Amino acid sequence: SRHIELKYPEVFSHGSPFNVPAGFYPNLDHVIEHYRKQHLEEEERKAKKLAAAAA
Amino acid sequence: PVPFETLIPYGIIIAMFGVTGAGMAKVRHMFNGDKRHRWSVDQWDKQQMERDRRLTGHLRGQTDNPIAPPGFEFNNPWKVXXXXX
């Protein structure tokens, strides 16, 4: 593997909630859609695995 | 009976504490433009006084005019330092 997968993807939710200047934090919905797709694909694989092998 | 002689030194100490607070409140009053001095000042209060200097020239100066005078746009002070950062 030359690719690193973050063990803590929750560092995208890090950052002080106080004295925040407008525009300081970046628009990271492209990131949240990545992780949403990853959770939905993994839910599907197991779904497709323990439902097609339970019959 | 009351031994007021032993009580004389204590009254001296109370008079000294009185003179420090008396004399320090007045020197600050005059220093601050014959107005009461500011106390628990944060970054916001200090910058607010800096913009007071911009409008009037005095850090304690106050003006209620709705329009800023000409030149106000360029008098915004950007501080310069040699070392720390």
């Binding site: 934090y25 970046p26 | 970054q43 360029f74 950007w78 501080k79 330092x81 040699x82």
Partner: protein
């Protein structure tokens, strides 16, 4: 320039270069620090939409919001100039009474309640604007309306009444 607090600053650098003619000019707010605090709750009664739009435009465009949000900032400084203009037109005496109080009170609001209540009376009558502090507790009197202020250095005389809009 950087937002870092300075420790060894000894000089100021001024740039006399003017803003370009492409950007529409706006007359700037000229009220000092204490006049602004006296009129602070009036401004957010009227310009809250403009004040919130300006902060939203900047949030919408990260890292590029000083530019690209310039029209909105001019809208906020015109809304606030109209409040400062309106207060001088009708409540000048009560306004100056309150902000000159705050000058000698560490600009602490609880230290000038008798002056504030009179200004709130005059601004509500003349400009129909009202001081509102959002999300205040529900089981007690609002702090800005209490007959007694615990942290006041001088006691509020009992005949000085808090201004309730309608009594």
């Amino acid at each position: 320039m950087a937002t870092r607090k300075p420790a060894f600053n000894q000089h100021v650098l001024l740039d006399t270069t003017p803003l370009p003619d492409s950007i529409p000019k706006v007359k700037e707010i000229g009220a000092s620090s204490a006049p602004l605090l006296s009129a602070s709750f009036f401004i957010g009664a009227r310009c809250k939409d403009y004040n919130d739009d300006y902060m939203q435009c900047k949030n919408e465009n990260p890292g590029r919001g000083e530019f690209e949000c310039l029209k909105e900032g001019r809208r906020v400084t015109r809304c606030a100039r109209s409040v400062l203009k309106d207060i001088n037109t009708h409540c000048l005496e009560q306004f100056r009474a309150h902000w000159q109080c705050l000058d000698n009170n560490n600009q602490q609001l609880w230290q000038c309640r008798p002056a504030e209540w009179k200004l709130n009376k005059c601004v509500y009558e003349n400009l129909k604007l009202e001081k509102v502090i959002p999300d205040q507790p529900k089981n007690s009197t609002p702090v800005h309306l209490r007959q007694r202020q615990i942290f006041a250095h001088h006691a509020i005389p009992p005949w000085e009444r808090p201004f309730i809009p309608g009594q």
